Amino acid sequence: PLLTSAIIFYLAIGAAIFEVLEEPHWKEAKKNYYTQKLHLLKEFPCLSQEGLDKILQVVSDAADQGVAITGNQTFNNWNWPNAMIFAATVITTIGYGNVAPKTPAGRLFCVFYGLFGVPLCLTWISALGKFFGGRAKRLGQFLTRRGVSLRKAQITCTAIFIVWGVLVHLVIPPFVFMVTEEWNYIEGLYYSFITISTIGFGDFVAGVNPSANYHALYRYFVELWIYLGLAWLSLFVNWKVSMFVEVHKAIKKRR
């Protein structure tokens, strides 16, 4: 009852701030959509309203079948490269949703695929995490022996690790995405945080743009960066779990 009574208000205030940060933009977007609707109607008096509804229905009929509304459909295709990373988005609980199964045969295969892969992959990432943590800790302790160990040395190593993670996964990438994707900084940072926390809305996906000249290995570099980010996330979350025991001990000292 101590947590729910705070998270209820957390959701309330989140909604209260989102409703004012976003609603003006949504209203102006709807108004512009309807204005351009009527102005396309007046541009083609030859085209009737009840035909515009048919065109809209056709466009929405296959925008949820997989084919993109505009341009070519090479990046949302179902061939080997796209599928090998759709599998990854499935088994890392990210689930962007730009490509998803649309057949009763596949929709049922994806269930067992997730049920058998997600628990496996969440261990592989933890294994990578513990291995890299062992390497970092042995290097740090060797260099601390070459120096002097300190009661605050663990503070130094932990802070170095945390700042390494923050730099590599929230402050450096947005510039790479400014360069190769032509997003501004806020978009790149927002997308990086969304992807790292396995939220994955699916409005910003890296390496999928018909109007782009990506290098042949850009997508796989993105995927590898995502995997390393998830591994560091596992390491830091276990470290913070243990440091929470530490601080719940140290609090009684203050009493």
The footprint of K ion on residues 96-135 (CB under 5 A) is 97
By C-beta, is 94 or 235 nearer to K ion? 94
By C-beta, is 66 or 140 nearer to a copy of itself? 66
Residue 172 contacts a copy of itself per CB under 8 A = no
Choose the one of a copy of itself, K ion, none that binds residue 224, judging by a C-beta under 5 to 8 angstroms depending on kind: none
Distance CA 204, CA 184 (A): 12
Residues 173-179: contacts with CB under 8 Å, at least 24 apart: 173/225, 177/206
Tell me the Cα Rg of the chain.
24
Task: Please count the residues of the chain.
Answer: 255
By C-beta, is 109 or 142 nearer to a copy of itself? 109
Q: How far is the CB of 172 from a copy of itself (least distance, A)?
A: 16
DSSP-derived secondary structure letter, 170: I
DSSP-derived secondary structure letter, 150: -
| Residue 145, CA atoms < 13 Å, CB-side half-sphere | 5
Distance CA 199, CA 97 (A): 11
Contact 187, 48 (CB under 8 A): no
Q: How far is the CB of 70 from a copy of itself (least distance, A)?
A: 5
Residue 130: helix, strand or coil by DSSP? Answer: helix
Site pattern 52..91 for a copy of itself (x: CB under 8 A): -xxxxxxxxxxxxxxx-xx--x---xxxx--xx-xxx-xx
Residues between 194 and 233 that touch K ion (CB under 5 A): 198, 200, 202
Contact 230, 198 (CB under 8 A): yes
Choose the one of K ion, a copy of itself, none that binds residue 164, judging by a C-beta under 5 to 8 angstroms depending on kind: none
Residues between 142 and 171 that touch a copy of itself (CB under 8 A): none
| Residue 40, CA atoms < 13 Å, CB-side half-sphere | 14
Residues between 184 and 223 that touch a copy of itself (CB under 8 A): 184, 186-187, 189-190, 193-194, 197-203
Choose the one of K ion, a copy of itself, none that binds residue 44, judging by a C-beta under 5 to 8 angstroms depending on kind: a copy of itself
Distance CA 165, CA 136 (A): 13
Q: How far is the CB of 196 from a copy of itself (least distance, A)?
A: 10
Q: How far is the CB of 96 from K ion (least distance, A)?
A: 5
Distance CA 227, CA 32 (A): 40
Choose the one of K ion, a copy of itself, none that binds residue 83, judging by a C-beta under 5 to 8 angstroms depending on kind: a copy of itself
- Near K ion by CB under 5 A, which window of 85-93, 110-118, 212-220, 228-236? 85-93
Residues between 122 and 141 that touch a copy of itself (CB under 8 A): 123-124, 127, 131
